[PDB]
Design a protein around this ligand. Sequence first.
Ligand SMILES: C=C(C)[C@]12C[C@@H](C)[C@@]34O[C@](Cc5ccccc5)(O[C@@H]1[C@@H]3C=C(COC(=O)Cc1ccc(O)c(OC)c1)C[C@]1(O)C(=O)C(C)=C[C@@H]41)O2
Ligand SMILES: C=C(C)[C@]12C[C@@H](C)[C@@]34O[C@](Cc5ccccc5)(O[C@@H]1[C@@H]3C=C(COC(=O)Cc1ccc(O)c(OC)c1)C[C@]1(O)C(=O)C(C)=C[C@@H]41)O2
Ligand SMILES: C=C(C)[C@]12C[C@@H](C)[C@@]34O[C@](Cc5ccccc5)(O[C@@H]1[C@@H]3C=C(COC(=O)Cc1ccc(O)c(OC)c1)C[C@]1(O)C(=O)C(C)=C[C@@H]41)O2
Ligand SMILES: C=C(C)[C@]12C[C@@H](C)[C@@]34O[C@](Cc5ccccc5)(O[C@@H]1[C@@H]3C=C(COC(=O)Cc1ccc(O)c(OC)c1)C[C@]1(O)C(=O)C(C)=C[C@@H]41)O2
Lengths: 445, 445, 445, 445
Amino acid sequence: SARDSVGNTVLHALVEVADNTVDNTKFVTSMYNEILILGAKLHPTLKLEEITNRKGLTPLALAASSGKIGVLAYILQREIHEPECRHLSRKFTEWAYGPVHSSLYDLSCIDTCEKNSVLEVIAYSSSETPNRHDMLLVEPLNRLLQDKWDRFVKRIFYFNFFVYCLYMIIFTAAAYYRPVEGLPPYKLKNTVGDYFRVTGEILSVSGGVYFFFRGIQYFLQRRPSLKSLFVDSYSEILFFVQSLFMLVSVVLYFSQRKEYVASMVFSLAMGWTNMLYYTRGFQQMGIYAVMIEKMILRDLCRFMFVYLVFLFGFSTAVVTLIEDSYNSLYSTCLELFKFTIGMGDLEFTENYDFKAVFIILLLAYVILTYILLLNMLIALMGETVNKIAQESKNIWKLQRAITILDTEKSFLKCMRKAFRSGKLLQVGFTPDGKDDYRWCFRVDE
Amino acid sequence: SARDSVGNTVLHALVEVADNTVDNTKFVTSMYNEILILGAKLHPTLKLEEITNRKGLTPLALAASSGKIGVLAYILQREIHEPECRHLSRKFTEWAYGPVHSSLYDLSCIDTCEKNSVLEVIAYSSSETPNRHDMLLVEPLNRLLQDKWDRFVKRIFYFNFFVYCLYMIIFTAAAYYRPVEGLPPYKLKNTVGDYFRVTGEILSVSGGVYFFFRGIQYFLQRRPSLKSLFVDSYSEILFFVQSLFMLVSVVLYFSQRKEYVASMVFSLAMGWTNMLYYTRGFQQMGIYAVMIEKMILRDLCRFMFVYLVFLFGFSTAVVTLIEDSYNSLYSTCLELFKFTIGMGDLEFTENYDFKAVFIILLLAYVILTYILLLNMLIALMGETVNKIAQESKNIWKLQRAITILDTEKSFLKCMRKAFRSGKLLQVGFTPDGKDDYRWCFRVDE
Amino acid sequence: SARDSVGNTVLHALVEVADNTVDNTKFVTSMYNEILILGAKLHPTLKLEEITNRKGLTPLALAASSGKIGVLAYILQREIHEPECRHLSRKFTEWAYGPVHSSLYDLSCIDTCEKNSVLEVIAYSSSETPNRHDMLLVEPLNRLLQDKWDRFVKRIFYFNFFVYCLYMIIFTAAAYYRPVEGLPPYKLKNTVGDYFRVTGEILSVSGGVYFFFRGIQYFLQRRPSLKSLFVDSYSEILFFVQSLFMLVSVVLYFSQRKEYVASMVFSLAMGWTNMLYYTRGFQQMGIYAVMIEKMILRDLCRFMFVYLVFLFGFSTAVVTLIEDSYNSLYSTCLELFKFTIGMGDLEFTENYDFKAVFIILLLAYVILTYILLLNMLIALMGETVNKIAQESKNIWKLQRAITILDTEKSFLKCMRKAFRSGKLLQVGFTPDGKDDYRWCFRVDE
Amino acid sequence: SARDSVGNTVLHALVEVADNTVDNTKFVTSMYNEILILGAKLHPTLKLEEITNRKGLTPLALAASSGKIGVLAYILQREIHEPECRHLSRKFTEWAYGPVHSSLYDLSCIDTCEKNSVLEVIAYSSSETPNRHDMLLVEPLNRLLQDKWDRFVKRIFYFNFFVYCLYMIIFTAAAYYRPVEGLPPYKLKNTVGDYFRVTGEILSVSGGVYFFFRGIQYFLQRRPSLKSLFVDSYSEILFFVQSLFMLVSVVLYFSQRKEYVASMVFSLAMGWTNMLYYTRGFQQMGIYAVMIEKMILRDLCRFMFVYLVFLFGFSTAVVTLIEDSYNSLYSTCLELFKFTIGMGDLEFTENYDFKAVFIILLLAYVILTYILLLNMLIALMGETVNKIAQESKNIWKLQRAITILDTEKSFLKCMRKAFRSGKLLQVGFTPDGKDDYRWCFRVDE
Ligand SMILES: C=C(C)[C@]12C[C@@H](C)[C@@]34O[C@](Cc5ccccc5)(O[C@@H]1[C@@H]3C=C(COC(=O)Cc1ccc(O)c(OC)c1)C[C@]1(O)C(=O)C(C)=C[C@@H]41)O2
Ligand SMILES: C=C(C)[C@]12C[C@@H](C)[C@@]34O[C@](Cc5ccccc5)(O[C@@H]1[C@@H]3C=C(COC(=O)Cc1ccc(O)c(OC)c1)C[C@]1(O)C(=O)C(C)=C[C@@H]41)O2
Ligand SMILES: C=C(C)[C@]12C[C@@H](C)[C@@]34O[C@](Cc5ccccc5)(O[C@@H]1[C@@H]3C=C(COC(=O)Cc1ccc(O)c(OC)c1)C[C@]1(O)C(=O)C(C)=C[C@@H]41)O2
Ligand SMILES: C=C(C)[C@]12C[C@@H](C)[C@@]34O[C@](Cc5ccccc5)(O[C@@H]1[C@@H]3C=C(COC(=O)Cc1ccc(O)c(OC)c1)C[C@]1(O)C(=O)C(C)=C[C@@H]41)O2
């Protein structure tokens, strides 16, 4: 039961030295196996893998968190059937048929840990985990998540998506049929239309408060950092910001400001786009939402900086050039923006001098932006998509895993009765003269 | 002549265990050689391949249907020239020249089977068959398809395409010169122009009925399932829907509804587009038609969901924002759609408050859809084509095979004289003192 | 001097059996060595390589023509320095330094053959020649083409390009300042402007006649076939068609038809775009002209068929739908075309019924063409360009070779004094007691 | 201390014969190591590496300049610990831990050489250097660049970028609020607004003069040639051109010309665009600036030639065709340009005859340019990016290196206190009884 200065034991050290190469994988797995067996023989009373570091991470949890696929895949699929060693086996084989094995896996601290489980550390990783997307392909995790999806989570997720659709329809109806008199709040009339509208407004604000508190719960439970605040937590941030716009709309509504509409429409717009959160977790249709997240966070910042540099530079040049209607910098910025959307006039004003200078500026602007910068954006998108589609293919599973964990955490029964299988003695051997059962889960493959 | 619970013999089991890898192919090949020789020696009177499974599939038909290209390539190119074994040979070599062999192939259950032939099961596969595109490159099948194409089917196909062109020209003329009086049906006038118009309408409806019954015949013969209804049968579904629009147009025409025009134009719009069906089967020009069938079935659903989520979200936000002409959600949806086609005004109304909110909403919509989502679609399509052009290169041949089989099934002569080859005694050895001929087919290659 | 049943020599058989694979290349090389040595020993009086096949091609010319790059590379780089074998060597080494060799090559039947040379057959190939792009990288051919380029051809080519630019400027000026009175021809006034205009017209027609006769000379010398008329001869066809439009313009001008303008502008348009012919042969800028040729001949036919099917189908549907401006099929075709160029109105007429049907037709047309068909075009172009840029990189050199051969064939001095090198005795050994000189060409590489 | 016929030492010859292949790397490395040791044994008093070639380049500086990455990596990472040989080692190992080494590097002639340092030659290369992108990843150079970045250069660079932002804001404000009276210069009024305006103008011209003299200093220090003037020096050329426009604006302003505005706006349009120079050196956002540089220098020339050939040809054809408002060639050129930006009318005039000819010309122009040429540009850009993204990844670091060297060279303190580390005796052994210290630099890696 040795420990290091950080508080971790030797098995954590074996995890850390991993780098997921073939020879490193062989070395680390062999050292893990041998040291664990030796620890069993010297101290059969005390298990090493139960020992956490100062961060409360077991070697399995550290291997999962740090993105070590060789180590995690070894540990989760570690079958030990030797004398005085079976009692630390992670999995077993009941039926040893040729094409198919009826393996049984111990799910201790993989679903329920009460500190942090393998699924929890994988799904709630910091996004720096190099193999988190492929880490769930490890047999017990893949089959466990698929089982939990089909068992109860699929229905709950579809119900939540349906309810969100109802919420957005109600919100859209309540906002669309908003009153057009001045100075809110608006007195209710006894007509049924006002009762339906105010019910819609109340449900809209109720959903806003729900998402607001859900966002707070997420941020408090996760405590993310600014450096990775948007790289992770993107969907939760968008839902939280939607709720923020809803609540600012409520404040302005009861503060007697027309500007409540200014907030409400944004929330409404955000609300509909937030339906893409529910498309993630579908392999067929979730690709676009993941790519939108990735491109907005990664690619849109640099492109928009360059594009705005071009647009502002040429807009300032043009608005300087003209003199007298379009003399504002805003109008010129909009006119130069129109070229991007294929609606630039290319002679939008005569009130100026030096025709050649003006047309040269506009031609250079459209060549640089419309013909060149946009096509360069397309080229970079083509390259990066060609590289990352294979990653999005697994971001599917990763988001489904997050969904499963969130559903288990809520669960709406005030209980954690979400276990799958196991009612009989599992191991058949202990260092003592007893037997143990640790939530055996069967995988036929 | 052992059998299993489904009724299938050991050869079907040898097919099922295949996975088209090199070592597996060698294993199944060797097992086939051993079991066939044993069948010859123990039961020369009993054929193994004639045995069908529960679904009426022979081992050859199962190998073809299940997409086991290695096993099928072995079986169709199986040359046996050993004592007391030649009688099970599938092919022979008459001329053993250096660069070229005059191979001779058996066509039993290749074109005529009376249950289901190799060409029938390959062509009418469920599209999940992993090797359907490349499976027809197996030498006897490729040569059979090319031979039957050049011999009879090429002329018949071009005639059918020409007749369909005549049908669409007649339909276009009859619809274009429709009368403009009220309340159909319209009385035939004695002028020759109206005689031609009514003849064109009659031929148009006649072709509609023809395609309607052809669609019914297809659905009854194939019995497609909902899960694979569109990935297979796409062209037949489109022709059937065209005919459905034509027949609804006829009903509305004789039901005294102007709305018949609404159906007729759709059928017309479908009919010309359905000419792309005839474009498939030409290696050069078919590439778009195939791609269209793919891009609609795979890419359009998800893209249109995301695009409509963005469009509806920002459209309902904008229509909420404006107040007073454009106040309907439909008009705002169209105005925001116009940005996609490069015709968005970006100031299409002044009737609102909070100009900053309105322009921010429109700019965000433009960036999310026009710049990001459309270019993302382009990126994904580029990646997809980069991956799938090599498969389209052969789905050309697959569609030509479907054309050949349909032409043979119709054949319009009240006969089944559609065999490919064979006029000479073939085998040279039987376990009895006789000889056999089984439609010998020559391949000089 | 062995021959086959057709009368071609065994060397021609060795060329024909080649397939440019490594083992085949080694086999044919060894057979060439053996047969050439045997020819030297048995019949030193008569050389094998001089004997032509039935088509009048030598084995070197056949190897070049048929695209057997390994055989040609072997032959042209064949150094033989053995007893009683030097006299048939193709090349030598004067300075055998480590990093560099001063190789010396025989140019027999490389530039001057009087039947067909290696450069002539490579440059004037059928475009199916698999290695024509890389075949000119064989050391003596690449060095000779570069030598001819730098020596005299580059100046002549740039002079011709400059003169063509002058011709097009003159043609543009003469056409731009055409008279606007009725019923040509136009009587000259004594003003200087008319004299300059008629001089420009005379030079324009003179250039037209020049290009007409050059096209005829090309077609007579090459005798291209319809199946490969455009895959080769594309630039010459375009120049010929330009000249045809010019001559039709002349006929209409003197036939008292205003329609001469209709022809002239087409020639003028072609006359400018044909400058891209001179762009080929420059590595930096010749990429676009090559790709325009390739895409028009390969990709534009099928894309335009599919696009016109969509456009015509939906245009006919829409023009059927509307009733009463825009009621012609031409106007509707133009309005639907405008969507492709980002200028579709999407409500271009109110004179119709069934708003939903009309807008559904237009939206479906937009999605099918503007969003899908154009993006599928882009995807296919991306794929094919990713595959063929490496071939364009060398068709640069191929077009330069064609330019060099054309310049030699003209040469503008009434002579053929276009030899590259050699003024000294070359071989040093003959089967007789003499010595020979065969245009030695030196390469320091 | 032997030399060759050029006067360069044997080590320069060893550098020249390198080609960065593995076997060549071993060959040259072994010969270099052995000859250096032999030089130590025979002439320990005189070092070989310090000796320059005719161009003033040491073998290290030549290896860096000529792009021989293997030789440079070996030399910079050359450790010798043998008797009478360790005194010429380039680096040492202080701590020989397993996963990490505390290497110690000698920086002689890496930052300061007084003829040519490694950083100077790499950063100020001619852009033909094949390995300049990856050459800075050699351990001591990468660590030096990162150290100098974090130590003092990062703050100085961000300060300069901030000051340039302030300069452009001041320039934009001064130009935007230019007076609108006639005939400059404009008399200064005593109102505060005009004092701020004239202060902004003075600061704008001051910055222009600063950038003018900085450009002159760059061109004098580098003395670039026309053939590589733009592939290198691109940013410096753009800053110089901005300053030239500013100074021409000053001359016209004091020359009593309104046309000063024509220059000033260009400088303004230049200046904002030149902010992209500062995006290089940030990995995330510097990709677009590098891509735009490469695109403009490589692809834009050929694309614009082909595009302008098409545009001018069809504009001349159309302007010839029309007759009577659009009759100028400029107006027709603009109308045909509008198709490129998605705003072509396709019936912009009726003043012609032969509508079919006019529309055919415009449709052909659209298909050739809008559909084919632009999408061809997209395809080529996609392929280009696919190949060159890996180059841009390191061009980031290369431009950061240029920034570091420029900051050290200017440094604005009248001092050169920009050394990294080293205050103790370094070598520990010399052929004499002495010891030496040469700016020992530590790398823990
Ligand atoms: C906090 C992030 C960074 C974000 C929040 C708002 C402001 C947002 O602008 C962005 C920045 C932006 C602004 C304008 C155009 C593009 C991007 O992108 C998102 C954010 C961008 C989106 C588009 O991305 C999505 O919401 C789709 C989505 C994909 C995957 C998901 O997991 C998801 O979870 C909800 C949502 C939609 C907006 O919320 C929206 O509808 C409005 C009016 C602006 C978009 O900021
Ligand atoms: C049943 C399928 C799914 C389909 C039937 C109709 C409604 C269709 O809309 C689609 C959905 C759609 C609607 C609007 C835009 C794009 C797609 O696509 C096809 C279908 C889509 C097509 C485009 O695809 C093709 O038919 C070309 C084609 C390619 C390959 C083939 O083998 C083929 O066989 C006929 C046809 C044309 C339409 O029939 C048409 O002309 C109209 C007005 C709508 C198109 O539904
Ligand atoms: C004979 C060929 C096939 C061709 C001849 C004419 C009709 C042409 O239309 C085409 C078909 C066409 C029509 C409309 C749009 C695109 C293509 O393409 C070329 C041909 C297409 C071209 C574009 O291709 C080029 O001429 C550039 C070029 C590239 C490489 C070359 O080696 C070259 O040699 C001259 C020319 C320009 C036109 O001649 C032109 O300017 C007009 C008015 C129509 C074009 O027919
Ligand atoms: C000397 C070069 C070749 C150049 C100088 C001027 C004329 C320039 O036109 C170009 C040619 C040109 C003209 C019109 C459209 C595109 C390109 O490109 C640049 C040059 C092109 C650019 C766009 O490229 C950039 O300057 C961004 C940039 C990227 C990377 C950098 O390291 C950088 O350093 C400042 C700048 C902007 C202009 O200076 C500009 O704002 C105007 C009005 C024309 C552009 O000439």
